[PDB]
Amino acid sequence: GTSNRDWWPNQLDLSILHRHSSLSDPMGKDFNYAQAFEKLDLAAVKRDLHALMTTSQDWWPADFGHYGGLFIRMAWHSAGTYRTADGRGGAGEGQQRFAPLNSWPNNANLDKARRLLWPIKQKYGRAISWADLLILTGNVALESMGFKTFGFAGGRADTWEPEDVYWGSEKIWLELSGGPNSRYSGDRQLENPLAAVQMGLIYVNPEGPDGNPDPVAAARDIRDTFARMAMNDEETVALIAGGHTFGKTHGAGPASNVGAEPEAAGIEAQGLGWKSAYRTGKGADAITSGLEVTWTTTPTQWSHNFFENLFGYEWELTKSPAGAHQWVAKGADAVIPDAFDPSKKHRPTMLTTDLSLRFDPAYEKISRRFHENPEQFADAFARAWFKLTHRDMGPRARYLGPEVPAEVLLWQDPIPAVDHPLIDAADAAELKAKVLASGLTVSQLVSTAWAAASTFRGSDKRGGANGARIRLAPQKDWEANQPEQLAAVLETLEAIRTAFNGAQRGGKQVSLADLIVLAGCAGVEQAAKNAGHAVTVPFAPGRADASQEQTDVESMAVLEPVADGFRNYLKGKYRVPAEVLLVDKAQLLTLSAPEMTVLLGGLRVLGANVGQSRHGVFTAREQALTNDFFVNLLDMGTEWKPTAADADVFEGRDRATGELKWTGTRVDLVFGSHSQLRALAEVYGSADAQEKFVRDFVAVWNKVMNLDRFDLA
Amino acid sequence: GTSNRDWWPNQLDLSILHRHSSLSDPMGKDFNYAQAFEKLDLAAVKRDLHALMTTSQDWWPADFGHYGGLFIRMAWHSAGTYRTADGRGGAGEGQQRFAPLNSWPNNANLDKARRLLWPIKQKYGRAISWADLLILTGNVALESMGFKTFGFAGGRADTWEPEDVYWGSEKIWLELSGGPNSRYSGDRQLENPLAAVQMGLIYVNPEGPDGNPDPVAAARDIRDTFARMAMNDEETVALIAGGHTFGKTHGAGPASNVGAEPEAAGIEAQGLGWKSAYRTGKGADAITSGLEVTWTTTPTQWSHNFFENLFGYEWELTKSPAGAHQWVAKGADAVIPDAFDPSKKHRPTMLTTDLSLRFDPAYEKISRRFHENPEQFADAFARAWFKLTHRDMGPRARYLGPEVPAEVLLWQDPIPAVDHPLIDAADAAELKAKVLASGLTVSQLVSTAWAAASTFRGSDKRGGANGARIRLAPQKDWEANQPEQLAAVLETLEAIRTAFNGAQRGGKQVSLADLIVLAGCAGVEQAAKNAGHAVTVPFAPGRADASQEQTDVESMAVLEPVADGFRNYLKGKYRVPAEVLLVDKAQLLTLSAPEMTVLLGGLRVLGANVGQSRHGVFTAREQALTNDFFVNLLDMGTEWKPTAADADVFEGRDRATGELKWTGTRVDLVFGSHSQLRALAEVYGSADAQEKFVRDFVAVWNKVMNLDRFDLA
Numbered sequence A, B: 001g002t003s004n005r006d007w008w009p010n011q012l013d014l015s016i017l018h019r020h021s022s023l024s025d026p027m028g029k030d031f032n033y034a035q036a037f038e039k040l041d042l043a044a045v046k047r048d049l050h051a052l053m054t055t056s057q058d059w060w061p062a063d064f065g066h067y068g069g070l071f072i073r074m075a076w077h078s079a080g081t082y083r084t085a086d087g088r089g090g091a092g093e094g095q096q097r098f099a100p101l102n103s104w105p106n107n108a109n110l111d112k113a114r115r116l117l118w119p120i121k122q123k124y125g126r127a128i129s130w131a132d133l134l135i136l137t138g139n140v141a142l143e144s145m146g147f148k149t150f151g152f153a154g155g156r157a158d159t160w161e162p163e164d165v166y167w168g169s170e171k172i173w174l175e176l177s178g179g180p181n182s183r184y185s186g187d188r189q190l191e192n193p194l195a196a197v198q199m200g201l202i203y204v205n206p207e208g209p210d211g212n213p214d215p216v217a218a219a220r221d222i223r224d225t226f227a228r229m230a231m232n233d234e235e236t237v238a239l240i241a242g243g244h245t246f247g248k249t250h251g252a253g254p255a256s257n258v259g260a261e262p263e264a265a266g267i268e269a270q271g272l273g274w275k276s277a278y279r280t281g282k283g284a285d286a287i288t289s290g291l292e293v294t295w296t297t298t299p300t301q302w303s304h305n306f307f308e309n310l311f312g313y314e315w316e317l318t319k320s321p322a323g324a325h326q327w328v329a330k331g332a333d334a335v336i337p338d339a340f341d342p343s344k345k346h347r348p349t350m351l352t353t354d355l356s357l358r359f360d361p362a363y364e365k366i367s368r369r370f371h372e373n374p375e376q377f378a379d380a381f382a383r384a385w386f387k388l389t390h391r392d393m394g395p396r397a398r399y400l401g402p403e404v405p406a407e408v409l410l411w412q413d414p415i416p417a418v419d420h421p422l423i424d425a426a427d428a429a430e431l432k433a434k435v436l437a438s439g440l441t442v443s444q445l446v447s448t449a450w451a452a453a454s455t456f457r458g459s460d461k462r463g464g465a466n467g468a469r470i471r472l473a474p475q476k477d478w479e480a481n482q483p484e485q486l487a488a489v490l491e492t493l494e495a496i497r498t499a500f501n502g503a504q505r506g507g508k509q510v511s512l513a514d515l516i517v518l519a520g521c522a523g524v525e526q527a528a529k530n531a532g533h534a535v536t537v538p539f540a541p542g543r544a545d546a547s548q549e550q551t552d553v554e555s556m557a558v559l560e561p562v563a564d565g566f567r568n569y570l571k572g573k574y575r576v577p578a579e580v581l582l583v584d585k586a587q588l589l590t591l592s593a594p595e596m597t598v599l600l601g602g603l604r605v606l607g608a609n610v611g612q613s614r615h616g617v618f619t620a621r622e623q624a625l626t627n628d629f630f631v632n633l634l635d636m637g638t639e640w641k642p643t644a645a646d647a648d649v650f651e652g653r654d655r656a657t658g659e660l661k662w663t664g665t666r667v668d669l670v671f672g673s674h675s676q677l678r679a680l681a682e683v684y685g686s687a688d689a690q691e692k693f694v695r696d697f698v699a700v701w702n703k704v705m706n707l708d709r710f711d712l713a
């Protein structure tokens, strides 16, 4: 069946904006997972999970009688797809159970792990999501094996179809670098937004870069990929050595024995894959990665044995039974237990990437400190495990249940508690009047609130106007935010704030975070007034101001908009067409195609463009809220051509006279080109639509203002 | 960016079931197009359309000063994608404005036609859909040129994204037959459900079959493709000769002059395509098909000149200026006007396919009768034009506005008016009790109502339980419907009906159509009771009983379900996997993936399978409404293998003992295999889901019962 994608493989795909509709969701439209989870008996779930750890099933027998290692790996793979560049991946949507992640080579036999959990999932039903359960099970595994965790939050609602994520362009699983779709270029520079070294891996190749077993060069890949998942050196050593304190790898025979991954397997396999022809195909004969390493003398108990072995032996390069590169301890006794035969013992072994923790000079210093101070290792690993598994969950207001850690961590982009009465409707009206009386323009007010609110991304629920981080480093200096204009707006707003707060009795005060948004609302109201419409824009107080010390400047860098079609902004020249970057931004902002359409058309006529560019400002009444963008865009009296100077900028001229009427970018003119976006533009550009446009604009404006407002959820 | 479809190109695609979500729709959730249209000033729209016909735009100058022909072609292409086999295509959703149709080669320069219409669309906004406007514009063209149409109905709501339709497997536009993805096999047999001879054509190739200019062989293609669009010989002659009474073709210069279709064109083209480098690229120089034929002496006026020319001259083969095969009357004077130069005249010309109407022996008899009796020609053309343009609009209850023809046509599958009071809630309860007291079983009742209701297809809104056509030829003898069991059930229900109706006063009576549905509702209520649950299934009366004489048997054949996964039924062995045919059926029934899942699991345990097959009957309490299907399907204690005898049937055996527990088909086991469908099955198979399962089952049951009830809309 030949499809539109076949005929026109480069046409913009909007269906990413209409994923996760009410159609595909089995739960009713009013289902509220937070309310279901809050009533769950989490303690009972945890008792069932503890019991599961040593309830071995014959179709996938437990190594050492204990599934803990398998489940820690499962939870670490669930979280381990996360990329800081876009916030996509991570554990927060339970995407491990869908394509393609359910079938990535690095997730082999995690289909078994998830299936072991079906009886518990089934028992508790909608009160615990798969997404939460995968993480909880990892926690319980740790606790079962003697490791005290830092805590756990519930609240990850299940999703019902695959997320659309760019995982790379390679057409071959696990393809080594330098191919026609190479994710590397230059001096081993991995293309953004990717955070793995090969298609179908979590972070790095356990044999070494492109399979070459050099622990020092492996360390460079580890550092880069882990940093692209928001982890620093200390967290990275703590995680890898913490994890490999438990369990084992599986490589008992050649990988050619292993059959189709789950999405390719026959229907009779009932959702499982990697069926193996090697001996029993499971247990002592299991094949997963192809490596055959067991790190510690007590693989089912927390210990300090990982760093004792790493430093205590010298290492020799050898091959697993499947042919993979791994290491064995020179001259060692057979001290490591076998997973099934009490009469067998094995020498200590390690992966290339384990040796990285010793032979990279910066990791060596950390590893040595953890070896000498095992309590530092345990605390670091607990904290890093919590971060790993919660990094995409968003603000602390989303965290549910009785095990939430009280300690507030820098990586959570924390927001101070509000300890005072909030402004009411009369106050908001007074503040809006003061804002409009100050002389701040519609363009200033709309631009500033847009800049504050539109840093939100739904992928990891970071960003948004809560916190007033626009006034701090680094947001105050982002090019998109027009740093000099921004400073003048903020100065004026802070004066208004100080005067209002100084006049209050009791402890009533307004945050700058709230006032920035309320001021934007006033701008939109004034713009509607300019166009002859009487509009009140909703506003919900309760944001607080974060401090600079509560704002990690390095971690904030990934939120910088280098492309924001809603402000007709592109920081540089990119491979990806600007319209593709627009749809990508709309998806991060959780907008549908209609919402994207209405919002962009309104922003253009309100003066939200960066640099006061005329591109796409298709109105003779700037700073009035009208549907002029759509009416003028769709006027067939105007003919469009790319400029001689810049093929990505277009001139619209009167067809009869040749007079210049407008200029526009690709982001502007895509709404007149793409057949689905033009259909939407037509609705808003029709003679009966001025009021619909205004109302739909106010709604999407308010949606964007409230994207991070989980304190209201 | 590599996708799931790249990795696993043969996995089932569910996204066809979640098109047309509220997310992609710009209109409010409460928007009702029928209510908007019913207030349109239709007469005003038609006055503006009339004016447009002779208001030439310089960017696409009107031939002969009149756009009528162009607009008739536009409206015939809008309707002419329709296939009777599945009901897909047709004018009824305005899909000509989206990919791929907007860019099919046979739709070249219809982008210009749609663009001419934007000012009128813009003026009337949401009160007239594009879908309605395209057809209305064709009618107005006809009327403006002196042709009396049969009428017009509004009510085609706009859609907002491309429909998923199988248009063929060729990867090359217009590929001639006999290629690697040939749509022909055997003795020129076109594969169902296709109704065109080449990818990107409407019906046939105007030069002749695969470009061979033989009118006699062209006629065979015409007949076949028109029949697959539900038109017989008389309708086909009337439509081709009627249309080619107007306007002209365009082939002024070589086709290599014509550039990229709209979906491939640059963004500056603003949704238009086929830009030509030949001379002025438009008007006198236009290139569309590559043919250069003008049929009549008055291309802007209704006449009987098409047949006067066809029969009045002898024809010779010649080439257009683009090199295409066409025919000319060399003995003729130059009597045909030029489209732009009043000083030029041309000889009569014809397409190969026009000559088919004279040199096919069956068409010649009809053509000759139309030639000698042009009033008969006009009436047949009017009737066929109405049918063509309304064939996918559904029941007459959907028809809106002041121009609906009063005559009821057999092709409309008409339903008699109801002229008597309807049963009320108490009566429905009395009837349900009577049905259950008759001895009819839950299986009989559910199977019969399913059979009656599930003939509906949303593609052309044909079928459904209204009419009680299950009692008539041919439905009563379809193998899926279990003709002997069905006869027994209907006899019993008819006796109940007769008794109830005989006891009433005041004219109150129940139709058999209603009672079949109500009896199915009773079956579902009894099944719920069997499982220990009291529920009431909603029921809406007002269906009526059609007669055999009001039922075209031939046209009913395409509604026969040869695959119905909801009854585990496959009439024969097909190339397409049964699970694909299930998703296709769900799409036709307008079901989402969740609704498909709930419905199938319930039907299995109610005894709806054809032949009382045990395949998929994963319960020990058949005829009780429970979630047993999902609980048992998802039990990892059962292991599934394909049978030796039939690779498409599976045995589920206890994993420990080997005892046979169940058998299933692909349709059954896909819900345990496909990662999205298994996720849905898990919701319904969880310990907290009994109540949700029953509620969601009753809701989707009711939805299927009411699919054709546009009298309630």
Ligand code: HEM
Pocket: A063, A068, A069, A070, A072, A073, A076, A203, A204, A205, A206, A222, A239, A240, A242, A243, A244, A246, A247, A248, A249, A250, A251, A287, A288, A289, A290, A291, A353
């Ligand atoms: C450089 C980063 C890492 C690499 C290259 C790596 C590699 C591997 C490989 C190849 C396996 C064997 C899979 C099999 O054959 O069954 C494995 C197992 C495992 N990994 Fe790691 N890993 C990494 C980081 C982590 C982290 C951060 C954790 C958790 C905090 C983790 C915990 C585990 C556990 C517990 C197992 C044992 C699974 C079992 O007993 O079945 N690993 N890892």
Ligand code: HEM
Pocket: B063, B068, B069, B070, B071, B072, B073, B076, B203, B204, B205, B206, B222, B239, B240, B242, B243, B244, B246, B247, B248, B249, B250, B251, B287, B288, B289, B290, B291, B353
């Ligand atoms: C065997 C079936 C038919 C074939 C092969 C066919 C073929 C064609 C072709 C090649 C053109 C020229 C397009 C161009 O170069 O501009 C055309 C024009 C046209 N066709 Fe047909 N046609 C068929 C049936 C119909 C029907 C059923 C109607 C309407 C009832 C219709 C109405 C027209 C009209 C009005 C035009 C003139 C367009 C103009 O003036 O711009 N045709 N047809």
Ligand SMILES: [Cl-]
Pocket: A088, A089, A090, A093, A095, A163, A164, A165
């Ligand atoms: Cl994701």
Ligand SMILES: [Cl-]
Pocket: B088, B089, B090, B095, B163, B164, B165
């Ligand atoms: Cl369709």
Ligand code: NA
Pocket: A087, A088, A089, A090, A092, A392, A458, A459, A460
């Ligand atoms: Na994410």
Ligand code: NA
Pocket: B087, B088, B089, B090, B092, B392, B458, B459, B460
């Ligand atoms: Na259709």
